[PDB]
Design a protein around this ligand. Structure first.
Ligand SMILES: Cc1ncc(COP(=O)(O)O)c(C=O)c1O
Ligand SMILES: Cc1ncc(COP(=O)(O)O)c(C=O)c1O
Ligand SMILES: [Cl-]
Ligand SMILES: [Cl-]
Lengths: 346, 349
């Protein structure tokens, strides 16, 4: 019924563009070498600059594949001697592992000890090539709050929180996001990168994995993921129309605030995650121990009521409500009402 | 208007429909790739490709984001242990070779670089290399390979510009791949068809995201796949089946090329760049005769005024290139021919 929604303006625009993008030609059949497309590339780049307040010295790239390709690219392009990572979840852990296959990694802090229910403390050593974080840990519902000011280059996987709120881009040397959550449709990954960090690795880098080759060719070194890039272009237009990332944040903060209040009020349920590290985007909650056996009964009940895709990833069990930008206040209230009624029957 | 670029209309409409409402009011852009609705598409696309292409048992089908260039690297990382060999028949072939050389030892066993890749060289395949890589249709130069290739070592092939233009004997190949923006689908997806028993034989470490095994173990959803581009491949396969398979698709293409080459050869304004026996049926390259060399630009503008678009050659050849993908109609080819025939800069009657 409702739970991975994309804004409707963006769906309609995309469909329109499939029927007729330019002069009768479908967006699926135009050349990516044509000027019509190059213009979209550049406007999308200018839109992301505007909407996110990207300063000078940062390049914007679009890659096919996902955040996982970037786990590798980050390491191959910046890990010369050694790099450090914060282990806050499945995605953080998968980044760390890919990087370890390339060279030396120090894990400077982890919350693996308590099923990643919290964000650990850490001291950033000043002699590593870069420091990599995962800002929203999608599976465990933790996010990072502290304004991070790294003495070395700061790399961040924002797959699950890019375009949910404004950020200070200048604090980061490289930001990336698989784009299927907020931000766009499956098939594209965004990379925003402070060019001056490249060129400092003695290892050879394959051409297709070399950020410089991509920068020099404005992300069309080879065929880019046109339609997914288009959906990013529209999503940026909609965020601007509706008054920017300040506003997007307020609506999200609210949606999360209601849902966490319901979780905490309701005796059937409890949030898994420490209050202070609670993510605004992925809201994880399990059955109270007393009602543990009702877990499956409630899934079926939510499904009967038209709520879909709130099952947690396996490792945590319980539930996870992913409150992406395009999920409405109304879809959140119907969850709350489903949870409330579940409590009142028991 | 006549369109060198066209996608079949059934496929465009189906994709648009699926963007509005794929399943129970939800757009294909908003469903979960972890949902059963999507998994079913993944599998039906796989079963369709198996059916339509007659893929034997022991071959896996994978879908990758990115393009054929990512596969240049994956191929080498997954199969080049000691050394491999390549045939140099063009820009794409040369780019594959280069990426592979950055990984390990490559013997280039034949090249047509000597004559601006106007022909397909002879070669002897050495039996002690890990694999032999070819580019079956050389998109920029308009050559394709004809000989039925029977390799004594694993045969890898970049079919980006000819996949789904005709039936092939899949059993001859150990790995086939295709960036999919030319016949078979829309930009954002690359197909890989792979004989699984060739994997596992490399001493080098392979990054997880580049390891074909990890992908196969997860049915191409090790991570988020390119959903919409995969859907367009799913529809393209349905259309090919409806209209009677790859045998039919071939006849129509062979015809379209046959007409256009006859016109190129008949017309004194123009000449085909490529040796006759190696002529590609997909990418038709032709330049101005030397006598009419200065008319090159005048003719581009003339074609454009007449509604023909995107026939300009890649820089390295100049001249022209008519890409006669499956979805380009006989009628669009005739209007090119009629445009060419209106060479009254000569006064032929
Ligand atoms: C924070 C985070 N990082 C990385 C990924 C992996 O994304 P992809 O499927 O684009 O490789 C995801 C996917 O959900 C995610 O939420
Ligand atoms: C034969 C061949 N190989 C490789 C490529 C590169 O594919 P991609 O742009 O999908 O990297 C192309 C692009 O046309 C091609 O025609
Ligand atoms: Cl996670
Ligand atoms: Cl070529």
């Amino acid at each position: 019924h409702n739970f991975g929604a994309m804004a409707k303006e963006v769906i309609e625009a995309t469909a329109k563009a499939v029927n007729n993008f330019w002069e009768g030609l479908s967006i699926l059949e135009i050349s990516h070498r044509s000027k019509e497309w190059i213009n979209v590339m550049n406007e999308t780049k200018a839109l992301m600059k505007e909407v996110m307040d990207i300063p000078e010295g940062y390049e914007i790239l679009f890659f096919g594949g996902g955040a996982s390709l970037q786990f590798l690219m980050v390491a191959m392009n910046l890990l010369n001697k050694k790099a450090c990572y914060l282990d806050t979840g499945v995605w953080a852990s998968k980044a760390i592992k890919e990087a370890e296959n390339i060279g030396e990694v120090k894990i400077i802090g982890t919350s693996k000890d308590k099923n990643y229910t919290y964000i650990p403390e850490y001291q950033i050593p000043s002699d590593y090539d870069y420091f990599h974080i995962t800002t929203n840990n999608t599976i465990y519902g933790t996010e990072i709050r502290k304004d991070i000011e790294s003495p070395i280059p700061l790399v961040a996987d924002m797959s699950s929180d890019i375009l949910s709120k404004p950020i200070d881009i200048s604090k980061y040397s490289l930001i990336y996001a698989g784009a299927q959550k907020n931000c766009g449709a499956a098939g594209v990954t965004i990379v925003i990168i402070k060019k001056e960090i490249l060129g400092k690795v003695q290892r050879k880098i394959p051409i297709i994995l070399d950020y410089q080759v991509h920068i020099l060719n404005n992300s069309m070194y080879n065929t880019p993921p046109v339609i997914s890039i288009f959906t990013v272009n529209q999503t940026l237009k909609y965020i601007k129309k509706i008054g920017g990332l300040k506003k997007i944040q307020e609506l999200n903060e609210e949606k999360a605030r209601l849902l966490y209040a319901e979780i905490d009020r309701n005796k059937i349920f409890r949030g898994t995650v420490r209050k202070k590290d609670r993510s605004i985007m992925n809201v994880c909650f399990v059955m109270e121990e007393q009602y543990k056996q009702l877990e499956n009964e409630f899934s079926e009940y939510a499904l009967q009521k038209g709520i879909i895709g709130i099952k947690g990833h396996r490792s945590v069990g319980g539930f996870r409500a992913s409150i992406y930008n395009a999920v409405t206040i109304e879809s959140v209230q119907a969850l709350i009402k489903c949870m409330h009624d579940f409590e009142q029957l028991h």
